[PDB]
Structure 1
């Protein structure tokens, strides 16, 4: 109920996101890409790590509006299974996947990874991990390990914080201030969320039996992403307030400007972590 109060219509998000409605870090490689092109570049950055071969099945955990799954089918000629908890995203994904000219299997399930136990070749998860909760991390990596073959690979892209000990080292004043903003994100933007640390993402993966190379930082790309999101929301103030309220407009400008600030101050990061099964190709 208190959390439900923070429910926001998809129409609001459309007033600050690119036409694909991607609600995650873009990849500005090369630097001159538009937000929309950078969102396709981020999908490619993830898929290009997964050693995907024709006829494999890719699981997308938190499949959004289906952009990742569509690009995987079109680029790699693979079957796809998407998991989402959003009825609207589910509806859109079925139609996105049905639209694709292919013989490959395309499936979208209105459920979480907890209830998913089908064999898959590869797994991608782009900024859903912040919504799982710390106590679920061992079950998540065990599930992911067990449903993949000997050459399995997974990418998880997640916003991350630092252990309070690490935060204290970079200024106490800045340490408490960051913790408070994180509390705001996890209360008002992603209610019930939890930012993991990169160390947590890595060590939970290793405990489950994965090889974990050095994670890729997307920090500078998230700064560019949040700058464009904030500037776009600000340019649509009138329409955003009209579609929601002044409260919600102020909340999301605080979020977007705030994240840009703490990413620039290197008190937040965004990690793309690769998880390799022992039999993964070299």
Structure 2
């Protein structure tokens, strides 16, 4: 029943196409250098993640939340690795299968319609780009234990996740702004990512360490998300008429509120986006 209440907030892939770049990447871009197009910045974000993973030819990369398959293809093409992708979306599964089958390679390419809970095959390296927000706090210990256990002695993982701060830390940066941010987060995890729950950077780090990972200083992507959300918002606005035709005025207003609102709270430093690297004890220096 509560699912039905959330099922209300389901939106066609066609709507997201009207604000996203041509790769349909629904995560923080990386504008390095600063004058990259959104689309180029999305390839630079993939490279930022993959370049941290010490990927060698013939290794297997696991992509947890593999989206439309952009990260896996880039991995196969750049690093000559086997790939396994996990997605819960039937549409993303079908697209990924086609993206991977198109690649000129002898490497193994696999996409599975399942969550990480059901995945227990040996892999060399793991990437997860803005899927972690959906796992839930109670599942973090199981997540990091699974990732540690499926990787070899030199295993590495990157997790990119939107984050909030502990209530105590939020209170420290103005009471007014603290309650305002909490209410906007509640809107995101009700109407935009139903059942979602933002971790803190500290949770991401400490759950990793409990599992046995070495965790260097997380990379903040805050200024890159501000630019991403600005372009998304401006793009949705430019396509207002088409967006309404495809869904409704309700859904257009909901997403403009989300995109403008996120840009605001990222600017006010009440939200962040953390790229966290997890190194197993035997990882290369």
Deviation per CA, 1:203-228: give whole Å up to 9, x if none.
Answer: 00000000000000000000000000
Task: Could you tell me which runs of 5 or more consecutive residues in structure 1 were left unpaired when the two chains were aligned.
Answer: none
Matches within 5 A, 1:230-249: 230-249=233-252
Distance 2:145 2:254 in 1: 36
Residues 225-252 of structure 1 deviation map (CA, whole Å, 9 limit, x = unaligned): 0000000000000000000000000000
Q: By how many angstroms is 1:10 displaced? A: 0.0
Distance in 2 (CA, whole Å) between partners of 1:271 and 1:9 is 28
Q: CA deviation at 1:53?
A: 0.0
Q: Counterparts of 2:283 and 2:161 in 1: how far apart (Å)?
A: 22
Distance, in Å, in 2 between the alignment partners of 1:62 and 1:112 is: 8
Q: Quick check: 1:127 aligned with 2:130?
A: yes
Aligned length: 282
Aligned-partner SS, 1:8: coil
Q: Confirm whether residue 268 of structure 1 aligns to residue 274 of structure 2.
A: no
CA distance in 2, matches of 1:214, 1:165: 22
Give the distance between the partners of 1:102 and 1:206, measured in 2 at CA: 36
- Measure how far apart 1:274 and its partner are: 0.1
Cα RMSD (Å) = 0.1
Deviation at 1:44, TM superposition (A): 0.0
Secondary structure of 1:184 counterpart: helix
Q: Cα distance, 1:74 vs. partner? A: 0.1
Match of 1:259 in 2: 262
* Separation in 1, partners of 2:11, 2:169: 34
Q: Given the two structures, how large is their TM-score scaled by the length of structure 1?
A: 1.00
1:95-154 CA-to-partner distances (Å, cap 9, x unmatched) read 000000000000000000000000000000000000000000000000000000000000
Matched residues in 2 for 1:136 and 1:245: separation? 35
How far 1:170 moved relative to its partner?
0.2
Cα offset, 1:63, TM superposition? 0.0
Specify the alignment match of 2:140 in structure 1: 137
Secondary structure of 2:160's aligned partner:
strand
TM-score normalised per structure 2: 0.99
Q: Note the C-alpha offset of 1:19.
A: 0.1
CA distance in 1, matches of 2:162, 2:103: 31
Shift of 1:6: 0.2
- Whether 1:106 and 2:109 are equivalent positions in the alignment is yes
Q: Which runs of 5+ in 2 are unaligned?
A: none
For 1:168 and 1:267, the matched residues in 2 are separated by 10
Cα distance between partner residues in 1 of 2:257 and 2:138? 29
Secondary structure of 2:148's aligned partner: helix
Aligned mates of 2:185, 2:198 — CA distance in 1: 8
CA distance in 2, matches of 1:195, 1:234: 27
Query: SS at 2:264's partner residue?
Result: helix
Give the C-alpha shift of residue 84 in structure 1.
Answer: 0.1
Secondary structure at 1:2 match in 2: helix
Moved over 4 A (4+): none
Distance 1:163 1:234 in 2: 33
